[PDB]
Amino acid sequence: GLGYGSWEIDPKDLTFLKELGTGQFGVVKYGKWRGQYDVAIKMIKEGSMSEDEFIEEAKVMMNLSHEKLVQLYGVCTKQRPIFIITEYMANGCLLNYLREMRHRFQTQQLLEMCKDVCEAMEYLESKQFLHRDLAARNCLVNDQGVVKVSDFGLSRYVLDDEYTSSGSKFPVRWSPPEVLMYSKFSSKSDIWAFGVLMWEIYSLGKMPYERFTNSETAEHIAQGLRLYRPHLASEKVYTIMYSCWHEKADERPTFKILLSNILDVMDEE
Numbered sequence: 001g002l003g004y005g006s007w008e009i010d011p012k013d014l015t016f017l018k019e020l021g022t023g024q025f026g027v028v029k030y031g032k033w034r035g036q037y038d039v040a041i042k043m044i045k046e047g048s049m050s051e052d053e054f055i056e057e058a059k060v061m062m063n064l065s066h067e068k069l070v071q072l073y074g075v076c077t078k079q080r081p082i083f084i085i086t087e088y089m090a091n092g093c094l095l096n097y098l099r100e101m102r103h104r105f106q107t108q109q110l111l112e113m114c115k116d117v118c119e120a121m122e123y124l125e126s127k128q129f130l131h132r133d134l135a136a137r138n139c140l141v142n143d144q145g146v147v148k149v150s151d152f153g154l155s156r157y158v159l160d161d162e163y164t165s166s167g168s169k170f171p172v173r174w175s176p177p178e179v180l181m182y183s184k185f186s187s188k189s190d191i192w193a194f195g196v197l198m199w200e201i202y203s204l205g206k207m208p209y210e211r212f213t214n215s216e217t218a219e220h221i222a223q224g225l226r227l228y229r230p231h232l233a234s235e236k237v238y239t240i241m242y243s244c245w246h247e248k249a250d251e252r253p254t255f256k257i258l259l260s261n262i263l264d265v266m267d268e269e
């Protein structure tokens with residue numbers, strides 16, 4: 001309506017129903033839009049985000065639509081704090097889901113989770129859109145057990161310097177050598193991170209390099225050493241995740257190639 005662009009949601013259309021948790025930018029809630037449609041509502045803490053830049057980018061993110069990407073519905077802009085409105089994912093973050101041992105996952109389920117993420121990432125790659133912080137903590141799970149990739153590109157708008165530089169909150173354990181050494185981000189740094197995410201999935205949510213500090217991790221990978229095979233990963237699955245960790249970025253696969261490799265293993269195993 002009148003005072004709203006296509007990227008803007010009227011906060012008066014929201015019904016708040018349950019507090020879901022707290023994240024980077026503060027509280028997240030479950031609610032309904034216009035009485036009917038399930039949404040997640042992120043309340044963005046004052047001073048946490050480069051808001052004008054985020055809002056311009058939200059225009060681009062709205063047009064990223066793939067069934068394995070958590071959809072951005074819009075932003076509530078006229079106000080303090082602003083809200084980000086997204087697709088509700090009832091089973092929450094992938095990391096916590098993996099860590100719940102009651103699920104008793106079969107390896108075919110774990111490979112399906114990898115395939116879900118890979119499809120999302122192949123779509124982002126086709127749009128020349130980098131995630132920049134791919135990890136299990138940034139994937140969500142819906143009520144049907146489908147994994148989707150969330151918060152794609154959002155790290156570009158975080159004002160907390162501890163998060164933004166290789167900083168005490170930087171994702172060292174998901175980063176390739178060229179990122180840690182010289183801040184060279186590319187499609188191939190997303191590929192690296194995807195390999196670590198596969199490792200997280202097959203490790204049922206263990207922390208990568210769990211016995212090392214971030215400084216030790218950086219030293220280990222710069223010296224050419226790697227994560228090794230999770231017990232639940234077959235030789236073929238391990239080969240796929242390991243392929244993401246070539247020292248030379250141009251020898252790493254694309255997401256299209258990874259997807260093909262994952263589908264081959266699904267057929268074989």
Ligand SMILES: CCOc1nc(-c2n[nH]c(=O)[nH]2)cc2ccccc12
Nearest residue numbers: 020021022028040086087089090092
């Ligand atoms: C602090 C974030 O926590 C959570 N976020 C979402 C969520 N859905 N969509 C989205 O963008 N976030 C869904 C959840 C479901 C159960 C428990 C926690 C959840």
